[PDB]
């Protein structure tokens, strides 16, 4: 009875979240109508974490769909699992955000934010013991970034003692389709650094490379990329959704993954013999964030293996990776690599592994955005679009300072010794 309230905002948030509900609905064996037609009772032991039990034994996700542009709502509602969701949980506007963070955070999103919190109060009050919230959104746009972080700030006011998770698609180093994304990303990161307990960094360029270089898709699409992200989201939340040797929640994950409150930005991975999975799983080629783990040290790591597989074999292989490449792990957090196993594998797979790393190498990402942010901000390029919504330049300078301070923090523990 540790329920999670899911929220998805913006195109990216809704497209990624919609595919996420498709994935776990299959894992819990729930059809688009919301009725269970599975085989094992282990699919239901912890189903109330992500679903409400409705009259007629229909299952309804604790999902809240948000955007300032109604177009993406209609796509969700007409998608494979469109009619699963609660009609009243579609909270949308008509104006859109125009890739403008200020519109999403201060004007257009501020008009709609209360309506979203009202839907949150419904869901949260209908929870035996509310555990926390999870958000899926992009940082480069205006709604998921600007309004997304506004929703986070408001939720922390009502629920200051609850856990806030996010799955944030970050700007990629070379692939971009938004000219002002450095402004939007830097403004969002300064919000995420303060009002989130855990943030999974997702990079579309890395996801595209996997789809193209590895999976051999000659014409990858956002559907293919979303499938990879959804597969990772299911893998991360496997322990929250299924029983097993591990009985842990989101707060325990944060307590053990975050040695310092601001450094809570994780590097996700996914794979694909047991030895070969652990080899893949730690590979740069399998990392969902555009940062080389070899360019830093892991503060903490979490690995989840799924499917019938030799436990002792995994333990030996994991322990080998730690001891073999121990120079990439901080020496002052003893036993900072923990592993969990679940008997239920995903669809069309016999074995799978999900990776969650709190690596100091993630500062490379915040370096990039800072340098891109400064190049535009020095010349106040495109700024009038933000000051026109009522922002002041000082709010831009503060975000620049904070993300540089965050970058400064990461470098501190990347060279710390015992």
């Amino acid at each position: 009875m540790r329920e999670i309230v899911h929220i998805q905002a913006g195109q990216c948030g809704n497209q990624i979240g919609a595919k996420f509900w498709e994935v776990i609905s299959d894992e819990h064996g729930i059809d688009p109508t919301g009725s269970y037609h599975g085989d094992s009772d282990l699919q239901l032991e912890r189903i109330n974490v992500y679903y409400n039990e409705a009259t007629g034994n229909k299952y309804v996700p604790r999902a809240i769909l948000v955007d300032l542009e109604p177009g993406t709502m209609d796509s969700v509602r007409s998608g494979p699992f469109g009619q699963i969701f609660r009609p009243d949980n579609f909270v949308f506007g008509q104006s859109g955000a125009g890739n403008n963070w200020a519109k999403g955070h201060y004007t257009e999103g501020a008009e709609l934010v209360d309506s979203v919190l009202d839907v949150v109060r419904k869901e949260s009050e209908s929870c035996d013991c509310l555990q926390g919230f999870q958000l899926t959104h992009s940082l480069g746009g205006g709604t998921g970034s600007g309004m997304g972080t506004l929703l986070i700030s408001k939720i922390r006011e009502e629920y200051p003692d609850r856990i806030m998770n996010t799955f944030s698609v970050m700007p990629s180093p070379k692939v971009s389709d938004t000219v002002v994304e450095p402004y939007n990303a830097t403004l969002s990161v300064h919000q995420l650094v303060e009002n989130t307990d855990e943030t999974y960094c997702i990079d579309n360029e890395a996801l595209y490379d996997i789809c193209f270089r590895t999976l051999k898709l000659t014409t990858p699409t956002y559907g293919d990329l979303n499938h990879l992200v959804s597969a990772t989201m299911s893998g991360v939340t496997t322990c929250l959704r299924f029983p097993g040797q591990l009985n842990a929640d989101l707060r325990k994950l944060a307590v053990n993954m975050v040695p310092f409150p601001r450094l809570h930005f994780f590097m996700p991975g996914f794979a694909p013999t047991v030895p070969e999975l652990t080899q893949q799983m730690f590979d740069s080629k399998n990392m969902m964030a555009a940062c080389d783990p070899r360019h830093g040290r892991y503060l903490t790591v979490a690995a989840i293996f799924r499917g019938r597989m030799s436990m002792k074999e995994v333990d030996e292989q994991m322990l080998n990776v730690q001891n073999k490449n121990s120079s990439y792990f901080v020496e002052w957090i003893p036993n900072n690599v923990k592993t969990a196993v679940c008997d239920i594998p995903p669809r069309g797979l016999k074995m799978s592994a999900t990776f969650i790393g709190n690596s100091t190498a993630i500062q490379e990402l915040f370096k990039r955005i800072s340098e891109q942010f400064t190049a535009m901000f020095r010349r106040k390029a495109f700024l009038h679009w933000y000051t026109g919504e009522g922002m002041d330049e000082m709010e831009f300078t503060e975000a620049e300072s904070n993300m540089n301070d965050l970058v400064s923090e990461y470098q501190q523990y990347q060279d710390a010794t015992a």
Binding site: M1, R2, D128, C129, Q131, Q245, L246, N247, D249, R251, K252, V255, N256, V258, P259, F260, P261, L299, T300, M311, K312, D315, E331, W332, I333, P334, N335, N336, K338, Y413, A416, A418
Partner: protein, 438 residues
């Protein structure tokens, strides 16, 4: 007849608590429904097995136990387990959300909200006691509840039952068996706060239990069931003196007077032998001298350490089964010559022995083999301090960089308590060194 109340705190204490009360019922012939045909005194009695069980007019023998956890997952299984009928629901207390591996959350935040209810339910059992002796507290060092709430309860028990004795059964964290990066923090904090309120504490290192299970029972990946069933055997042998007629360790107060000349050094090392796989075809019966010698092999201890490099201040031998005093005395004589056994000059080099003719019991379908003679040795050796140093070193590595400290401060604790408790452990480690090293 003086009663003993058992309090199980957190996941480890509760799950171990069940394995213990599962075994107690088998050793006494108590059925899962609570009715034991062997009992002639219905609705009461002054029998020794009543020290752990109360009786009802209906014939049910109700354990004198309380299970407490800050989330209901573990205790729910108790309420719906094979032994569900055995306890009245009131003895099972559960919260809503756990301490999340945070000593502060279990001690300060949530401990304050549930302490009064727990003490009331304990006092309900005490009111059914005519000569209550003390408490046996089962808990883990690592869990947020096991470490945080337990230290709070032990403080209140020293207040509400000042004269009564308190014994600990503590699970020492081990990387092999599902630990958390912050368990060294929790283990140090709960030891510091509980040290002055615990008369005698039996540590059990999951590393040692894990290796014993994986080596002597041929279990590739031991589960919590494997470890708890083995842990229950050592606990049962330690508590048998309270549940059966005898003249040794019959009172909780006797436990430390026979094992603890120094108040703070109250962590006796437990060694158990023989551990035999039931899968073993027709395991040849071992001898008294053979199992007694195994009590000095480090591979059989509950805490992997080297008593040869410490000093003993007390030693007890607890035999179960067909054992005659002549064989025990013969075995001791022979192994004093072979083994390195150095007592402190201010104590006598002696062994307090006890024999219970009932052979050890084994759970049906369990991994332990039905043996005819078994022994558990309890020795207060300074070598157990090796465990504190290991834990203290891990504490130091993280605390030097204040990793995870913010989680504890956020719950109301001050960084001062981190350094205060570490200072206490530095003193405890040094106390051990003065006694056990020249």
């Amino acid at each position: 007849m003086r009663e003993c109340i058992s309090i199980h705190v957190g996941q480890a204490g509760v799950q171990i608590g069940n394995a213990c009360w599962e075994l107690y019922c088998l050793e006494h012939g108590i059925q899962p429904d609570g009715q034991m045909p062997s009992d002639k005194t219905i609705g009461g009695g002054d029998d020794s097995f009543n020290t752990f069980f109360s009786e009802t007019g209906a014939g049910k023998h109700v354990p004198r136990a309380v299970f407490v956890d800050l989330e209901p997952t573990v205790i729910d299984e108790v309420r719906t387990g094979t032994y569900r009928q055995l306890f009245h629901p009131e003895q099972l207390i559960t919260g809503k959300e756990d301490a999340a591996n945070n000593y502060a959350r279990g001690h300060y935040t949530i401990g304050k909200e549930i302490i009064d209810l727990v003490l009331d339910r304990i006092r309900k059992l005490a009111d059914q006691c005519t000569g209550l002796q003390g408490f046996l507290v089962f808990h883990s060092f690592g869990g947020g509840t096991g470490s945080g709430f337990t230290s709070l309860l032990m403080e209140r028990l020293s207040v509400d039952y000042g004269k009564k004795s308190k014994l600990e059964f503590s699970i020492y964290p081990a990387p092999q068996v599902s630990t958390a990066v912050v368990e060294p923090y929790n283990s140090i904090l709960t030891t510091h706060t509980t040290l002055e309120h615990s008369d005698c504490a039996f540590m059990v290192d999951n590393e040692a239990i894990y290796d014993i299970c994986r080596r002597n029972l041929d279990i590739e990946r031991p589960t919590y069931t494997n470890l708890n069933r083995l842990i229950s055997q050592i606990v049962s042998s330690i508590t048998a003196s309270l549940r059966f007629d005898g003249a040794l360790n019959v009172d909780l107060t006797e436990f430390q007077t026979n094992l603890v000349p120094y108040p703070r050094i109250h962590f006796p090392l437990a060694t158990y032998a023989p551990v035999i796989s039931a899968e073993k075809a027709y395991h040849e019966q071992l001898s008294v001298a053979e199992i007694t010698n195994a009590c000095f092999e480090p591979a059989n201890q509950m805490v992997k350490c080297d008593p040869r490099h410490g000093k003993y201040m007390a030693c007890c031998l607890l035999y179960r089964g067909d054992v005659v005093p002549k064989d025990v005395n013969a075995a001791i004589a022979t192994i004093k010559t072979k083994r390195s056994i150095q007592f402190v000059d201010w104590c006598p080099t002696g062994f307090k022995v006890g024999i219970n003719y009932q052979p050890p019991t084994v759970v049906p379908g369990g991994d332990l083999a039905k043996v005819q003679r078994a022994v558990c040795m309890l020795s207060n050796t300074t070598a157990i301090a090796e465990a504190w140093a290991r834990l203290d070193h891990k504490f130091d590595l993280m605390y030097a960089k204040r990793a995870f400290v913010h989680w504890y401060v956020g719950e109301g604790m001050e960084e001062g308590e981190f350094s205060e408790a570490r200072e206490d452990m530095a003193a405890l480690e040094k106390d051990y060194e003065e006694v056990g090293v020249d």
